[PDB]
Amino acid sequence: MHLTPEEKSAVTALWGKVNVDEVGGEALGRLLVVYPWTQRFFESFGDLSTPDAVMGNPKVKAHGKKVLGAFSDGLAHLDNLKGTFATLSELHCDKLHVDPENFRLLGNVLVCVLAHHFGKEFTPPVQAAYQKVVAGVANALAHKYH
Amino acid sequence: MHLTPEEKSAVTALWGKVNVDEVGGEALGRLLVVYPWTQRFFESFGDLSTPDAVMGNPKVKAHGKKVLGAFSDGLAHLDNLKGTFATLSELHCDKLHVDPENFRLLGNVLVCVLAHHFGKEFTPPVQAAYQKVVAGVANALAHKYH
Amino acid sequence: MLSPADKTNVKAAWGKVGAHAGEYGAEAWERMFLSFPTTKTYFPHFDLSHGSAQVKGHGKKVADALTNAVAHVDDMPNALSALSDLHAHKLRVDPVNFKLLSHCLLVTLAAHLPAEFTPAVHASLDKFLASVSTVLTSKYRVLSPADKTNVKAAWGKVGAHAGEYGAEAWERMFLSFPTTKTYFPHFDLSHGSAQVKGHGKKVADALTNAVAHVDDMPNALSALSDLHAHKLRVDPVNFKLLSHCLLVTLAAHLPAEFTPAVHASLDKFLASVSTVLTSKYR
Ligand code: HEM
Ligand code: HEM
Ligand code: HEM
Ligand code: HEM
């Protein structure tokens, strides 16, 4: 995944300020609230009946932690997103049957959460850098679909 | 651009029977009729008000021929679409100001025209091969956008 | 599209935006140009340098139009009637760009309204911007009498093959767009599969029903609307892929009938069907 040195530094600098568990819980919950069709994967999580129930669901938060931790790990391999996520890609296709459009929706919801979390520090050039990275991650997760 | 031997044989085989002139004018014309906002780039072509006007417009036929002739050349360099189309990519960004989403639309119109022309010979696996190729060409044309 | 609670959240959120609408509007456009550089192709006549008076003025016009839209949320198509005309006949912006601007407007709102940007208000805002985008692109090309004539003529010729063509459309889609196979892990998707045949026929029959009720499509497909929104929960992007593969199938079987005019009418018809089937998703 090709970024400029500036762009990479801006991505990593902000990510050092992220509470991953919190932000992962936030991002997955907002995905399920804003685009409720994504709930189809998570019927075993329990109550998703209202936004507060989703946002407060322990299973949702736990998945959100799992997902963003792997994202986090990925940020250390920006030069090789495809390789880093190859096995995760095969699993989401062959076993989990997840439409890769969902990865793009989550990327956009994550960008919103970062903006909400960091306010003015989330500048237009910092957002641009994050948009390249979430597209890069979505593409890498979709790469082994067949 | 990577295809399987089955895919490449199918694409090259059918293209040998394409009269690029006739297919090119058909493809561009249907683009302008089905998605009329694309007419915004061709204000100097004259009469575009009705399908009959568009389809019989000499400037449209001529331009279609040019566009698919370049597409044709790309089919000879499947292994390096980005390298083949780099100059035209820069031209479409910097001089023509064409939204690359238009390359995707034309791609799909061209597949419709091939199905219309060849009928049952344009089988599902043959179409799949062409869908990969038109996506590859559109991405190649969008590559130098900035 | 918007429930009354949705309308409540947007008015509450936008009021708080208030006198900052102009600067926020300019920020949203600046974010878009930077994050999605292809959108710059519609502004080659602007100085897009940061803080440019052209961008600031454009942002303020766009924010005002949104304020007008918020003020008349119950009658948006009439309130934005002029702007609809302008985008459809003059500016002619590809519809995909509206989603990109909407996303950057959401990012902007998020960065400036910490207290207000709750999950529910986020959802409402995303819906509202999608509805605005729909109104602004609504006159680009709903079905005119000539379209309805072309569809019935084309589908009539389909006739008793409607089933077999439906199976072919699905097969073409699974091969050309393999991501659609994720919604069918319980099928045999091999060529000739009787599961695919039966599904294709049901889908074809449903389309025959839509053609027959072309003037009353929301009611005729209402049950199927419910099914896709609340059970199957198919991402809306996939409907455009099936529509394309239906077009290819028809083109391959109807050499005489698939004229440019009939092609355009079929594409409009399948987009309307797709709109109806995703109408209850949120
Ligand atoms: C940033 C994007 C994503 C990353 C990096 C990611 C990563 C992961 C990881 C690390 C696992 C664990 C697999 C294992 O235990 O071996 C997982 C599982 C899973 N993911 Fe993804 N995921 C992403 C997006 C999504 C999205 C958007 C959906 C669907 C809406 C999804 C649905 C699932 C499901 C249903 C499971 C399995 C649940 C379980 O077994 O407990 N993923 N994901
Ligand atoms: C398969 C994709 C395409 C290819 C390979 C292609 C190729 C070309 C070529 C070779 C030229 C000739 C320019 C010259 O002679 O200097 C050209 C010009 C042009 N193309 Fe593209 N093109 C493609 C798609 C499109 C699309 C979809 C649009 C817009 C809807 C477009 C709009 C234009 C315009 C406006 C010109 C200049 C015409 C003029 O000089 O009046 N192109 N294209
Ligand atoms: C929420 C969606 C949008 C709204 C409410 C909106 C509204 C407006 C308004 C109010 C104007 C100015 C009319 C006047 O001169 O009085 C305008 C102009 C324009 N819009 Fe849209 N717009 C939207 C989206 C878009 C998108 C997505 C694009 C392109 C990516 C776009 C491109 C343009 C262009 C090129 C102009 C003309 C600029 C000039 O020369 O002054 N619009 N828009
Ligand atoms: C023109 C658009 C569409 C129409 C008219 C349509 C219609 C239908 C119909 C009539 C059924 C059967 C309901 C019953 O059993 O009574 C069905 C089922 C289904 N649809 Fe849709 N559909 C459309 C698009 C899509 C798309 C784009 C996808 C996914 C790529 C999809 C996926 C499904 C699934 C997963 C089922 C259930 C299959 C089963 O297990 O029996 N649909 N649809």
Swiss-Prot record, chains A, B:
Changing residue 117 to P: reported impact? In Saitama; unstable
The effect annotated for residue 143 to R is: In Abruzzo; O(2) affinity up
Q: What is the effect of changing residue 144 to E?
A: In Mito; O(2) affinity up
- Name its GO BP terms in alphabetical order: blood vessel diameter maintenance; carbon dioxide transport; cellular oxidant detoxification; hydrogen peroxide catabolic process; inflammatory response; nitric oxide transport; oxygen transport; platelet aggregation
Q: Impact of mutating residue 69 to S?
A: In City of Hope
Q: What is the effect of changing residue 23 to D?
A: In Strasbourg; O(2) affinity up
Effect caused by changing residue 68 to H = In Brisbane; O(2) affinity up
Additional info? One molecule of 2,3-bisphosphoglycerate can bind to two beta chains per hemoglobin tetramer.
Q: Subunit arrangement?
A: Heterotetramer of two alpha chains and two beta chains in adult hemoglobin A (HbA). Heterotetramer of two zeta chains and two beta chains in hemoglobin Portland-2, detected in fetuses and neonates with homozygous alpha-thalassemia.
Q: What is this protein called?
A: Hemoglobin subunit beta
From Swiss-Prot, chain C:
Annotated site, Not glycated, chain positions: 11, 56, 60, 90, 99, 152, 197, 201, 231, 240
| GO BP, one annotated term | carbon dioxide transport
Linked pathology is: Heinz body anemias: Form of non-spherocytic hemolytic anemia of Dacie type 1. After splenectomy, which has little benefit, basophilic inclusions called Heinz bodies are demonstrable in the erythrocytes. Before splenectomy, diffuse or punctate basophilia may be evident. Most of these cases are probably instances of hemoglobinopathy. The hemoglobin demonstrates heat lability. Heinz bodies are observed also with the Ivemark syndrome (asplenia with cardiovascular anomalies) and with glutathione peroxidase deficiency.
One GO cellular component, as annotated = membrane
Provide the residue positions that the database annotates as binding O2. Answer: 58, 199
Instruction: Report the residues modified as N6-acetyllysine.
Output: 16, 157
Assembly, in brief, is: Heterotetramer of two alpha chains and two beta chains in adult hemoglobin A (HbA); two alpha chains and two delta chains in adult hemoglobin A2 (HbA2); two alpha chains and two epsilon chains in early embryonic hemoglobin Gower-2; two alpha chains and two gamma chains in fetal hemoglobin F (HbF). (Microbial infection) Interacts with Staphylococcus aureus protein isdB.
Q: Under the GO molecular function aspect, what terms does this record hold?
A: heme binding; iron ion binding; oxygen binding; oxygen carrier activity
Write down what this protein is called: Hemoglobin subunit alpha
Similarity annotation: Belongs to the globin family.
UniProt's post-translational modification comment states:
The initiator Met is not cleaved in variant Thionville and is acetylated.
Phosphotyrosine: modified positions: 24, 165
Report the superkingdom from the record.
Eukaryota
Residue list for modification Phosphoserine: 3, 35, 49, 102, 124, 131, 138, 144, 176, 190, 243, 265, 272, 279
- Free-text function comment from the UniProt entry: Involved in oxygen transport from the lung to the various peripheral tissues.
Modified positions (N6-succinyllysine) are: 7, 11, 16, 40, 148, 152, 157, 181
Q: Which PANTHER family match?
A: HEMOGLOBIN FAMILY MEMBER (PTHR11442), HEMOGLOBIN SUBUNIT ALPHA (PTHR11442:SF48)
Question: Which Pfam families does its entry note?
Answer: Globin
Q: Where does heme b bind?
A: 87, 228
- More details: Gives blood its red color.
- Record keywords: Metal-binding included? yes
Glycosylated sites: 7, 16, 40, 61, 148, 157, 181, 202
Question: Positions modified as Phosphothreonine?
Answer: 8, 108, 134, 137, 149, 249, 275, 278
Q: Outline the extent of the Globin domain.
A: 1-282
InterPro entries from the xrefs?
Globin, Globin-like_sf, Globin/Proto, Hemoglobin_a-typ, Hemoglobin_oxygen_transport, Hemoglobin_pi
Tissue expression notes: Red blood cells.
